[PDB]
Design a protein around this motif. Structure first.
Motif, PDB file in Angstrom:
ATOM      1  N   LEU A   1       0.848  -1.184   0.000  1.00 36.52           N
ATOM      2  CA  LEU A   1       0.000   0.000   0.000  1.00 36.52           C
ATOM      3  C   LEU A   1       0.886   1.236   0.000  1.00 36.52           C
ATOM      4  N   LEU A   2       0.548   2.207  -0.845  1.00 39.16           N
ATOM      5  CA  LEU A   2       1.345   3.410  -1.019  1.00 39.16           C
ATOM      6  C   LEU A   2       0.497   4.644  -0.747  1.00 39.16           C
ATOM      7  N   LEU A   3       1.093   5.622  -0.072  1.00 40.63           N
ATOM      8  CA  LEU A   3       0.449   6.895   0.222  1.00 40.63           C
ATOM      9  C   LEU A   3       1.215   7.996  -0.499  1.00 40.63           C
ATOM     10  N   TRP A   4       0.508   8.786  -1.301  1.00 39.92           N
ATOM     11  CA  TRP A   4       1.132   9.780  -2.161  1.00 39.92           C
ATOM     12  C   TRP A   4       0.772  11.191  -1.716  1.00 39.92           C
ATOM     13  N   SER A   5       1.797  11.977  -1.400  1.00 38.52           N
ATOM     14  CA  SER A   5       1.640  13.410  -1.185  1.00 38.52           C
ATOM     15  C   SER A   5       1.963  14.152  -2.473  1.00 38.52           C
ATOM     16  N   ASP A   6       2.126  15.472  -2.388  1.00 37.09           N
ATOM     17  CA  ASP A   6       2.511  16.250  -3.558  1.00 37.09           C
ATOM     18  C   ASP A   6       4.013  16.320  -3.800  1.00 37.09           C
ATOM     19  N   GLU A   7       4.857  15.904  -2.854  1.00 38.30           N
ATOM     20  CA  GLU A   7       6.299  15.884  -3.077  1.00 38.30           C
ATOM     21  C   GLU A   7       6.983  14.581  -2.697  1.00 38.30           C
ATOM     22  N   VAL A   8       6.410  13.761  -1.819  1.00 38.72           N
ATOM     23  CA  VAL A   8       7.052  12.534  -1.366  1.00 38.72           C
ATOM     24  C   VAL A   8       6.058  11.387  -1.468  1.00 38.72           C
TER      25      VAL A   8
ATOM     26  N   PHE B   1       5.254   7.504   0.376  1.00 40.16           N
ATOM     27  CA  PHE B   1       5.529   6.665   1.530  1.00 40.16           C
ATOM     28  C   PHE B   1       5.137   5.219   1.259  1.00 40.16           C
ATOM     29  N   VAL B   2       5.738   4.317   2.031  1.00 40.92           N
ATOM     30  CA  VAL B   2       5.456   2.889   1.965  1.00 40.92           C
ATOM     31  C   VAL B   2       5.119   2.408   3.367  1.00 40.92           C
ATOM     32  N   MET B   3       4.000   1.703   3.503  1.00 39.98           N
ATOM     33  CA  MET B   3       3.543   1.216   4.797  1.00 39.98           C
ATOM     34  C   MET B   3       3.748  -0.290   4.899  1.00 39.98           C
ATOM     35  N   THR B   4       4.278  -0.728   6.038  1.00 41.71           N
ATOM     36  CA  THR B   4       4.534  -2.140   6.277  1.00 41.71           C
ATOM     37  C   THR B   4       4.454  -2.409   7.772  1.00 41.71           C
TER      38      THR B   4
ATOM     39  N   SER C   1      -0.932  -1.631  17.050  1.00 44.62           N
ATOM     40  CA  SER C   1      -0.592  -0.228  17.239  1.00 44.62           C
ATOM     41  C   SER C   1       0.864  -0.027  17.629  1.00 44.62           C
ATOM     42  N   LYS C   2       1.616  -1.103  17.851  1.00 42.06           N
ATOM     43  CA  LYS C   2       3.001  -1.011  18.284  1.00 42.06           C
ATOM     44  C   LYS C   2       3.994  -1.541  17.260  1.00 42.06           C
ATOM     45  N   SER C   3       3.528  -2.064  16.130  1.00 45.19           N
ATOM     46  CA  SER C   3       4.401  -2.681  15.139  1.00 45.19           C
ATOM     47  C   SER C   3       4.054  -2.213  13.734  1.00 45.19           C
ATOM     48  N   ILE C   4       3.882  -0.907  13.554  1.00 46.36           N
ATOM     49  CA  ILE C   4       3.559  -0.320  12.259  1.00 46.36           C
ATOM     50  C   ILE C   4       4.650   0.676  11.891  1.00 46.36           C
ATOM     51  N   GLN C   5       5.062   0.660  10.623  1.00 47.27           N
ATOM     52  CA  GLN C   5       6.189   1.455  10.156  1.00 47.27           C
ATOM     53  C   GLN C   5       5.820   2.222   8.894  1.00 47.27           C
ATOM     54  N   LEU C   6       6.401   3.412   8.745  1.00 50.39           N
ATOM     55  CA  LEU C   6       6.254   4.237   7.551  1.00 50.39           C
ATOM     56  C   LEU C   6       7.629   4.732   7.127  1.00 50.39           C
ATOM     57  N   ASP C   7       7.923   4.646   5.831  1.00 47.18           N
ATOM     58  CA  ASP C   7       9.232   5.007   5.302  1.00 47.18           C
ATOM     59  C   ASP C   7       9.075   5.795   4.007  1.00 47.18           C
ATOM     60  N   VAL C   8      10.168   6.432   3.590  1.00 47.70           N
ATOM     61  CA  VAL C   8      10.203   7.256   2.386  1.00 47.70           C
ATOM     62  C   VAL C   8      10.729   6.424   1.226  1.00 47.70           C
ATOM     63  N   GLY C   9      10.047   6.499   0.084  1.00 49.98           N
ATOM     64  CA  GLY C   9      10.400   5.668  -1.050  1.00 49.98           C
ATOM     65  C   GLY C   9      10.873   6.387  -2.299  1.00 49.98           C
TER      66      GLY C   9
END
Lengths: 49, 49
Positions: A16-23, A25-28, A35-43
């Motif tokens: 699943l990918l989340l798209w802003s206007d400049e960056v 993100f990738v969710m895994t 609620s304690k094992s969720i991560q977001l990173d820049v792709g």
């Protein structure tokens, strides 16, 4: 730092990918999704309208 | 566009801030004060110590 607001969510390639206007993100997770094992990173660093 | 009237004595520092289509300006650190200038000439004021 570039300041972004989430606008679109797109599923792609078993992820699943989340798209802003400049960056973009990738969710895994690191196991069972809680609620304690969720991560977001820049792709990527492209631009879009 | 316009002629400013800020005070710059030595090498200053400029910084750009982009939030949306209505929040864009520069920040000036001359060395002993703080000044803010828009992207069309207008100047605002800063209060504090």
């Amino acid at each position: 730092p570039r300041i972004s607001i989430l606008k679109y969510a797109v599923p792609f390639s078993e992820q699943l990918l989340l798209w802003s206007d400049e960056v973009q993100f990738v969710m895994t997770s690191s196991g069972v999704l809680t609620s304690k094992s969720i991560q977001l990173d820049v792709g990527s660093e492209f631009a879009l309208g | 566009k316009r002629r400013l009237n800020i005070d710059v004595e030595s090498n200053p520092k400029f910084h750009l801030i982009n939030r949306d289509e209505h929040e864009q300006y520069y920040i000036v650190f001359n060395g002993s004060n703080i000044q803010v200038v828009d992207l069309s000439g207008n100047q605002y004021s800063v209060s504090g110590a």
